[PDB]
């Protein structure tokens, strides 16, 4: 086993790292931003153990950012200021009464922070500082993780399992020589337990909870795998778990030409630089996975990156990648199954005016899901024409007493305007909510250049009102988008509402035609089937006083009555003015 440092970057490996960083202007400017941020940190006071409510998490995360940055800077520059400032942070945190195990993410992230510093600075620390820091890792990090009242995340399939197993494993590695049998058992515990959350990447790497939740668990899962690879030369089969390595392709393709994500489920629009993407691109020897991160590294203010507590890992995993001279990905379509299937289609990775469609199957009962099954977003000519409201801020909803996290059919969650199907780009039948027990599979797809498409079976989402419902969405002739619903009624008639949510200005120019205008661009909505419709708009204003305002948005669409015992088609085309 390597001695210290044994986490992520071994004893002499900074020298080769320096060479690749000096050979790339983009990596060099990131490295220098970190070094200059460390110069500022030298003059900033150590953290205090002050919670916000039940959580110390803001402090544990800042501790990770400070100690990772300073420890990286010390190993790369050997500036004494960085060593001493990091040591002061480590001794301060070691003196905390506890690292708040009743919200164990706080302990996990604090343990990772103190462990990286302990390990990366070990050879340059006094025996007294080593002993102080080691005892805090053991007594405030590792020991609470062995307590049944604190470690239920070992049984969970969510981000807590990945994050807590990663953090405690970093502790077990950092203090290995003080308790070898015990640390080996802790490493084994994490390797076995982390398979639970990794199951949800199967089979294709789509992330069931969507764009904003991808970062946390996945990144800590990668910190764990990478540390095992560097320490043991292997990861005990973790990276081979079905679908896990495919999740980098998922995240890359989730960014539309605008730079904004397909923000289904509880998600925001904007992302950030994701250091874990550079690990995936290194493990897979596939720099084409980094096309979106390239834009962030090249264009963004580096101050945006300097809030990222894992930022030095992006440089550790840089793998000699030459950012500016990267080639765009060859594949312009990405499809994945699993609990939340998605299809992500674009006409070009290089043309900023490209048509993009993101569409999803899945279930409203999935963690963080909305009643959005079969919905889509659409961009063209630099404008998002068909949108998704995204999440609503949790704190106000919870403080108001809204039953936000109940996923059952009758839950108050679905009385939140932004979360039910009347505000998403999909069907509502008989004025009903979607069935939360519904699960729409992706049944077929093609990346054919003139007919890129995907199809989902929506029947179980409308089980009580119709016999069958299938939806296809396609990009046709690289020129327009078609949304096609095929509905088979039961022996009862059904009323179907077709909905599109937009921030563009809406003008109904004909009985079957509407013009959307935004940012000096135009898109035309044409209802091809049925031939006879009454175009409508619906307000996006709050319905309940806990609904957030939605200024500048409009719902447009129509309703069709479908007779009993019939097979019917609804077909709508979306044609950019460029087309
Ligand atoms: Ca000693
Ligand atoms: Ca999960
Ligand atoms: Ca409003
Ligand atoms: Mn939504």
* 208 within domain boundaries: no
User: What is the domain count for the chain?
Assistant: 2
Closest C-alpha to 287, from 335, 343, 325, 254: 325
Binding site annotation covers 368? no
Q: Which domain holds residue 508?
A: 333-576
Rounded distance from Cα 554 to ligand 3 centre (Å): 10
**Last residue of some domain: 176, 193, 210?**
193
The Cα–Cα gap between 67 and 75 comes to 12
CA dist list (Å): 327 to 289, 352, 382: 10, 16, 22
Q: Which numbered ligand comes closest to the C-alpha of 423?
A: 4
Position 156 in a domain: yes
User: Which of 144, 173, 193 delimits the end of a domain?
Assistant: 193
Dist. CA 569–CA 366, nearest whole Å:
29
Which has the closest alpha carbon to 390: 405, 411, 365, 369? 369
Residue 363 lies in a domain: yes
Q: Facing residues of 574 across strands?
A: 481, 525
Give residue 543 CA to ligand 3 midpoint distance, Å.
9
Task: Please give the Cα distance from 425 to 196 (Å, whole number).
Answer: 33
Q: How far apart are CA 289 and CA 491, in angstroms?
A: 50
Q: Which two tokens stand for residue 93?
A: 């945190």
388 annotated ligand-binding residue: yes
Annotate 507-519 with three-state secondary structure.
Answer: EEEECCEEEEEEC
Look up residue 375 and give its two tokens: 């919905």
Q: Does 31 appear as a known binding residue?
A: no
CATH (domain of 187)? 1.50.10.100
Q: For residue 535, give the CATH number of its domain.
A: 2.70.98.70
The set of residues, in sequence order, having a beta carbon less than 8 Å from that of 93 and lying 6+ positions away, is 46, 47, 63, 99, 110, 113, 114, 136
- Cα→Cα distances 211→114, 411, 442, Å: 29, 24, 19
- Find the 93 Cα to ligand 1 centroid distance in Å: 20
At residue 444, the 3 state secondary structure works out as strand
Partners of 485 in the β-ladder: 471, 570
127 in a labelled binding site? yes
Helix (H) or strand (E) holding 27: helix 25-42
Experimental technique of record: X-ray
Q: Is 424 labelled a binding residue?
A: yes
**Count of residues in the chain:** 579
**Strand-by-strand arrangement of the 356-360 sheet:** 333-336, 342-346, 356-360, 376-380, 383-386
What is the spatial distance between Cα 513 and Cα 523, in angstroms, rounded to a whole number?
A: 11
Residue 381 forms part of a structural domain: yes
- 157 among the known binding-site residues? yes
Mark whether 551 and 402 lie in a shared domain.
yes
Query: 502 CA to middle of ligand 3, Å?
Result: 13
Q: Is residue 280 part of a domain?
A: no
Instruction: Indicate whether 99 belongs to any domain.
Output: yes
Whether residue 141 is contained in a domain is answered as yes
The packing angle between helices 105-121 and 80-94, to 10°, is: 140
What separation in Å is there between the alpha carbon of 537 and the centre of ligand 3? Answer: 14
Radius of gyration of the chain (CA): 26
Q: Which ligand is nearest to the CA of 128?
A: 1
3-state secondary structure of 129: helix
Q: What is the stated resolution of the deposited model, in angstroms?
A: 1.9
Of the three residues 163, 193, 223, the one that is the final residue of a domain is 193
**DSSP 8-state assignment for residue 45:** P
Copy the structure tokens of residue 118. Answer: 């302990």
Q: Is residue 17 part of a domain?
A: no
What is the SS3 string spanning 448-501?
A: CCCEEEEEEECHHHHCCCCCEEEEEEEEECCCEEEEEEEEECCCCCEEEEEEEE
Whether 266 and 213 have beta carbons less than 8 Å apart is answered as yes
């Amino acid at each position: 086993m390597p001695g210290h440092p044994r986490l992520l970057l071994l004893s002499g490996e900074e020298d080769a790292l320096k060479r690749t960083i000096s050979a790339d202007k983009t990596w060099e400017k990131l490295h220098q931003a970190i070094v200059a941020e460390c110069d500022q940190l030298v003059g900033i006071e150590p953290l205090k153990r002050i919670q916000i409510g039940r959580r110390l998490l803001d402090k544990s995360r800042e501790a990770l950012r400070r100690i990772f940055y300073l420890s990286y800077a010390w190993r790369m520059t050997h500036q004494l200021n960085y060593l001493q400032r990091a040591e002061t942070e480590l001794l301060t945190i070691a003196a905390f009464s506890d690292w708040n195990p009743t919200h164990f993410l706080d302990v996990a992230e604090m343990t990772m922070a103190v462990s990286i510093g302990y390990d990366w600075l070990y050879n340059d620390l006094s025996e007294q500082s080593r002993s102080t820091i080691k005892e805090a890792i053991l007594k405030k990090g590792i020991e609470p993780s062995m307590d049944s009242k604190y470690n239920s995340w070992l049984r969970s399939s969510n981000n807590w399992n990945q994050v807590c197993n990663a953090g405690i494993t970093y502790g077990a590695i950092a203090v290995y020589e003080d308790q070898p049998e015990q640390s080996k058992a802790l490493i084994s515990r994490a390797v076995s337990a982390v398979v639970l959350p990794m199951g949800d990447y199967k089979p294709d790497g789509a992330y069931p909870e969507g764009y904003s939740y991808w970062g946390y668990g996945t990144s800590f899962n990668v910190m764990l795998i990478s540390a095992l690879d560097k320490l043991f030369g292997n990861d005990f089969g973790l990276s081979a778990q079905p679908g896990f390595l495919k999740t980098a392709g998922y995240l890359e393709n989730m960014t539309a030409p605008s730079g904004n994500a397909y923000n289904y489920s509880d998600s925001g629009l904007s992302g950030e630089l994701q250091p874990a993407m550079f690990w995936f691109a290194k493990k897979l020897n596939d720099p084409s996975l980094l096309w979106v991160e390239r834009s962030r590294l090249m264009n963004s203010n580096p101050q945006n990156h300097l809030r990222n507590r894992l930022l030095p890992a992006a440089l550790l995993w840089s793998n000699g990648v030459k950012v500016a001279q990267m080639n765009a990905p060859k594949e312009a379509m990405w499809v994945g199954e699993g609990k939340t299937p998605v299809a992500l289609m674009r006409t070009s990775w290089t043309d900023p005016a490209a048509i993009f469609v993101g569409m999803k199957g899945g279930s409203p009962g999935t963690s963080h899901a909305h009643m959005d099954v079969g919905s889509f977003v659409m961009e063209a000519d630099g404008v998002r024409w068909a949108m998704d409201f995204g999440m609503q801020e949790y704190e106000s909803l919870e403080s108001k007493g809204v039953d936000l996290w109940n996923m059952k059919q009758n839950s108050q969650r679905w009385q939140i305007l932004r979360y039910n199907n009347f505000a998403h780009n999909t069907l509502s039948i008989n004025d009903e909510l979607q069935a939360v027990d519904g699960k729409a599979p992706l049944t077929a797809h093609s990346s054919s250049a003139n007919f890129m498409n995907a199809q989902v079976d929506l029947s179980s989402l409308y089980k009580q009102s119709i016999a069958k419902a299938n939806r296809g969405i396609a990009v046709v002739d690289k020129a327009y988008v078609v949304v096609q619903d095929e509905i088979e009624t039961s022996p009862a008639e059904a009323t179907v509402r077709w909905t599109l949510l937009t921030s563009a200005t809406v003008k109904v120019t004909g009985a079957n035609q509407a013009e959307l205008t935004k940012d000096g661009k135009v898109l035309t909505i044409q209802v091809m089937e049925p031939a006879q419709i009454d175009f409508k708009t619906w307000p996006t204003e709050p319905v309940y006083d806990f609904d957030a305002p939605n200024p500048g948005t409009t719902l447009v669409g129509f309703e069709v009555k479908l007779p009993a015992n019939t097979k019917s088609v609804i077909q709508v085309t979306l044609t950019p003015g460029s087309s």
